[PDB]
Every structure is written in C-alpha cells, then in structure tokens.
C-alpha cells in the first residue's frame, strides 16, 4: 500500500495504523499506541511535540547564528543564566510561575479540546476555535485547528490535496526537528559548544572532528 | 451603527427609538436587561446634568481666575477651593448638603420607582409629568416643539461635559495649573505640549 518504515515486512501493526493518518508509515514496534484512545492521544502528543520542537530548534539555530555574528545573544544552553545576570530584578520563581500559569491556560484549552473536540469553539472563544478534525475520521477539534486565527493565511481552506501536502510537510519537519533537538542536546553534552559551532567546526575540518573525537561518545579515543 | 459605520446595533438599542442619543453605542452590552437600561438611562441623565453643572463651574471660575473679576473667593484654584473661609465651616455645609440632597434625591427616586406618583406637594399645587427622567421642569416652555431634537442636544452636551470633567480631573492629576492654563500651555507650541509629554501618562517614556 504505502511506503513503510521497513520495506517489505507485512507484520505492520493491525488496522489502527492504516494509511490514513498523516505521517503514517507503520512505525510502532513497541505498540505504544495500539488502543484507539491512546492512538489519538499520541497523535496529539506527536503534533504538539513536532510544533514545539520546530519552534525551539528554529530559535536555537537563530540564536546560535547571531552568537557567531558577534551579537549580544547567548547560546541556547546558557540563556537562562545570561538573562538572570542581565536582568537581576526578575525573580526566577516569579518567571517560572508566570510561565506555568500562562502556559496552563492555553494547555487546558487544548486539554478540554482533547476531551471534547467541539467544546472550545463556543463561550468566550469564537467558532474559529472549534477545530477541523482530521485524525480518526472526526471533523472537529484535534491537533489541526482551522479558522482565521490559527490559519490566518488560510492555506488549508480550499484544495484538499494542498492541505494533505502541507500536513505531510508539517509532520515530516516536526519529526526532523525533534531529532534535531535530540542532536543539539547530545552535541552540547559531548562537545560543550553550540549547534552552529559544531556544524562550522565539522565543515571547516571534515576529518578529526567527528563524534568519535569528542571523548564522550567513544569514551577512550 | 451611528456610532460606528459597518457595525450593527446591539438588538435592544434598535427597537427603542425613544432614547436620547441612541446611536447604537453599547459594545459591552451593559443595558441588555430593560430595567438595567432604565437605571442606566437615569444614571445618564443624572451624571450628564451634574457634569454639565460642574464643568461650567470649573470653566467659569477658572476664566474669572485667569482674567480677574471676583475677589479672593474667585482668585483660587478649583482644587484649592476649600482654602476660603466662606460663611460656614466644612462640617455644617456638608451636613446641610446631606439633608437637602437626601430630600431632593429621595423625591427623584420616588418618581423613579413610580412615575407620576410624586408630582404633588403638600401645598396642593400640581405639575404636569411626561416620560420618566423628564419631569416637566420647563417654566418658559421650550418643550412644545420638536422635543426629540432638544433632548438630543441635551444628551450630546451632557456626554461632552462628562468627557470634559474626566479630562479636567485627568489633566489636574497629570499637569499642574488651571485647566485654562493647561489649554493655553497646550496651545503654546502645540507639537510638544500634549498628553504624551507628561512623564505620568505613557509610562513607557521617561520611566
């Protein structure tokens, strides 16, 4: 049918990972989303992780490019202490609690959308926050939210194949950015420098600058 | 719709044409409840009339302060009006104000809860009554012709004067001097002297 995560091989999990979800290639060897409710929850988690990692990786890349350009911009792994030193009037608990509260408001909005896909498009929010559905066949709520506010340019209203192409773009870029953030953390742990620093160090010297030469991955060379 | 083109009147301001200055302006919909709207219309009339009286007093007394007509009574700032000795001290003036305004405002509220029930005095004399907040206190009679236009003029002046007194208190708590002095100091340049160049209004500038 579709291109699988391991070509050939027809033991791909039973027909809950059929070729319907965006990004579906039959990759669930551990069965972590076997039940349909867990599958929907994990689709929400995957889309959210992809979008969050995409935002985070874009921010990390831009702050690392600005750091190499001489700007007064810290690296991603030390921006918290740099912000606290530059701004001593801010309490750490203050900023943390404010982040918790504001993030919690929108996350409870998303949570009550997960519980009831149609319950967030009324009340204080307008009908644009109803959602458009997609996963598991429903046409309301879910990770994909239409409207003129979360799709203000309207690039998935009209032309359904354009919507499918853009959804595939989003899921592939999100998975790539999740692996990118994993690589960022591993490179910071094994080298102690930024991502762009590692990239230009490897581009300047292709050899003797691989992962085996940092002394952390291979722990004796 | 009148207050904002390409906007729709909030339903309960559409069918009731008999409101002075009904321009459809109720975006927060305070008076959707008809009794709440009646209360807010009475509050309109009261606040507007007291604000017209107050702003006229401020402007006239500050004009007499800037030009010079009255003696030491009129040669004080409006916010420093209590420095004069006058004829009575503070306490008895406030007390008699409480008493007679209790009398008049309870007459007005008794009219409010039952329109036309309180128009007769113990002396036996009687007056005509119309509408609710318009008790026919018209001696020289300008109400016999186009009363809607006169009411519209009154409500426009009332809204202008409520805005005026809000401006008076905001200017006084922002910039020193009389409001006429503030208008003149504005008119001095006027490209620099305005509400941004205060250091007490925008807060983003000048800390």
């Amino acid at each position: 049918v579709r291109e699988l995560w391991f070509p050939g091989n027809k033991e791909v999990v039973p027909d809950y990972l059929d070729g319907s979800l965006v990004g579906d290639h039959g990759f669930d060897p551990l069965g972590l989303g076997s039940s349909p409710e867990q599958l929907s929850w994990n689709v929400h988690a995957e889309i959210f992780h992809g979008r969050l990692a995409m935002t985070g990786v874009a921010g990390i890349l831009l702050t690392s490019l600005l750091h190499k350009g001489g700007a007064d911009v810290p690296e991603w792994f030390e921006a918290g202490r740099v912000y606290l030193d530059r701004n001593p009037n801010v309490d750490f608990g203050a900023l943390l609690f404010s982040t918790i509260v504001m993030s919690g408001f929108v996350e409870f909005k998303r949570l009550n959308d997960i519980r009831n896909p149609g319950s967030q498009g009324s009340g204080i929010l307008p009908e644009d926050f109803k959602g458009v559905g997609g996963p598991q066949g429903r046409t309301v709520g879910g990770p994909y939210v239409g409207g003129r506010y979360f799709d203000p340019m309207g690039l998935c209203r009209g032309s359904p194949e354009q919507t499918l192409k853009y959804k595939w773009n989003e899921i592939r870029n999100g998975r790539l950015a999740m692996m990118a953030f994993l690589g960022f953390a591993a490179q910071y742990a094994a080298t102690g420098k930024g991502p762009i620093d590692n990239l230009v160090d490897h581009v300047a010297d292709p050899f003797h600058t691989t992962f085996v030469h940092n002394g952390v991955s291979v722990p004796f060379i | 719709a009148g207050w904002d083109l390409s906007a729709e009147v909030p339903a309960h301001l559409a069918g009731r044409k008999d409101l002075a200055g009904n321009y459809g302006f109720d975006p927060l919909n305070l008076g959707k409840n008809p009794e709440a709207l009646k209360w807010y219309q009475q509050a309109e009339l009261q606040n507007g009339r007291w604000a017209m009286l107050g702003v006229a007093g401020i402007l006239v007394q500050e004009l007499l302060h800037s030009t010079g007509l009255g003696g030491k009574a009129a040669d004080v700032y409006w916010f420093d009006a209590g420095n004069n000795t006058f004829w009575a001290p503070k306490e008895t003036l406030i007390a008699i104000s409480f008493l007679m305004f209790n009398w008049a405002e309870l007459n007005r509220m008794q009219d409010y809860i039952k329109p036309g029930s309180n128009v007769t005095d113990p002396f036996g004399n009687k007056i005509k009554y119309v509408e609710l907040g318009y008790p026919g206190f018209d001696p020289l009679s300008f109400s016999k012709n186009n009363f809607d236009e006169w009411k519209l003029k009154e409500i426009k002046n009332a809204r202008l004067a409520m805005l005026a007194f809000l401006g008076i208190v905001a200017q006084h708590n922002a910039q020193p001097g009389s409001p006429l002095e503030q208008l003149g100091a504005h008119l001095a340049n006027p490209w620099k002297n305005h509400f941004i160049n205060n250091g007490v209004s925008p807060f983003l500038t000048d800390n």
Binding site: G31, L32, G33, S34, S35, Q38 | -
Partner: protein, 41 residues
C-alpha cells in the same frame, strides 16, 4: 497497550508503585525537612 495497562492496574503492581511513590515522597520530605520532631508551625 490495554492489556499492558490492565497489568499495571493489577493489585501488586499498583501497591508496589503506590508504596514506592509514598516512600519516595516521605524520603524527599525528610531530605528537605529533616529532624522534624514536632509540627511547629
């Protein structure tokens, strides 16, 4: 994972995880608030 979560909901797994989290909570309470002989407010 319905059967796996049902196994996790079985009485021994739940009681071991519950005594584990309760013991860990008490241990970290004594780690941050040691030698609390009385409830002095």
């Amino acid at each position: 994972m319905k059967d796996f979560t049902t196994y996790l909901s079985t009485a021994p797994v739940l009681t071991l995880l519950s005594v584990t989290v309760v013991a860990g909570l008490l241990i970290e309470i004594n780690r941050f608030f040691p030698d609390a002989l009385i409830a002095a407010f």
